[PDB]
Amino acid sequence: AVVASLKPLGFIASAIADGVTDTQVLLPDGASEHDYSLRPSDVKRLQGADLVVWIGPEMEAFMEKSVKNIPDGKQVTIAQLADVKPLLMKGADYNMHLWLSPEIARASAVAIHEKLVELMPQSRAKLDANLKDFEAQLAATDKQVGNELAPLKGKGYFVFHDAYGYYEKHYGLTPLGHFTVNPEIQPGAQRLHEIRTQLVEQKATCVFAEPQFRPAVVEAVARGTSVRMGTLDPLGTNIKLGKTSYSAFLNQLANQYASCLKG
């Protein structure tokens, strides 16, 4: 099997290795990328994976550990890829929420495909063809999203937790800023003040919760005000692995942003 660390890395691998081997996500639905640690049975899945896909040690900390035993032909480490490295952003030490960069996704699909062809050479036929389709969906989605999000350029909003840099920069969104960075921090207390003042001084159209964290803090700093409220799910927790899953992720996310920000 192809064992992906996070669900949207699954979405990608599931497209490339469709019909060739199954894909498996380690980080379960509704857990957060910051704050997991590998089950014994999750390490089994890694030890006997055909191919392992993850970002890199600055992101999925919890699995740097087990990935040192795995050799280079049996894994794809997306933060240290040829075409990705050059376009890593800074953390306002780089932002690693890469799985939302279509350019990076592309580069990842490529590298996955390469390694699978190597390991499973009698499936080259299908693999080559799965990839072609991916590149096509992905391209055609990047177009539709672009259009959907284009009218939200300018509209300022706030997000819980800083995950969306890559996506936001690429489609030209206009975030006023984030509540946290690591969302195991609260954050309080001045942070929450600076947001409040910004929201009541008109200035912001939407504020965005997340499903893997209590919206609790976001209602508040908003109640009373003319700010609308929504949610963003950066792990597409409610999307099934499949060919068209990663293109669905981006569309969903676009719709999440837009469903609140439209006007």
Author numbering: 27 to 118, 143 to 313
Copy the relevant paper text.
In bacteria, high-affinity zinc import is accomplished by ATP-binding cassette (ABC) transporters, which rely on extracellular solute-binding proteins (SBPs) to acquire the metal and deliver it to the membrane permease. By this classification, SBPs that bind zinc, manganese or iron belong to cluster A-I, which is defined by two related α/β domains linked by a long α-helix. The ZnuA proteins of Gram-negative species primarily belong to group II, which is defined by zinc specificity, the presence of a long flexible loop rich in His and Asp/Glu residues, and metal coordination by three His residues and one Glu residue or water in a tetrahedral geometry. Here, we characterize zinc binding to the cluster A-I SBP ZnuA from the human pathogen Citrobacter koseri (Ck ZnuA) and present the crystal structure of the holo form.
A screen of additives identified hexatungstotellurate to contribute to larger, better-ordered crystals, as has previously been reviewed. These crystals belonged to space group P2, with six copies of Ck ZnuA in the asymmetric unit. With a formal charge of minus six, TEW often interacts electrostatically with positively charged residues and through hydrogen bonding in protein structures. Each TEW in the Ck ZnuA structure is in close proximity to Lys91 of four symmetry-related protein chains. All residues could be modeled into the electron density with the exception of the His-rich loop, which is typical of cluster A-I SBP structures, where this region is disordered. In all six chains zinc is bound between the domains and is coordinated by Glu59, His60, His147 and His211.
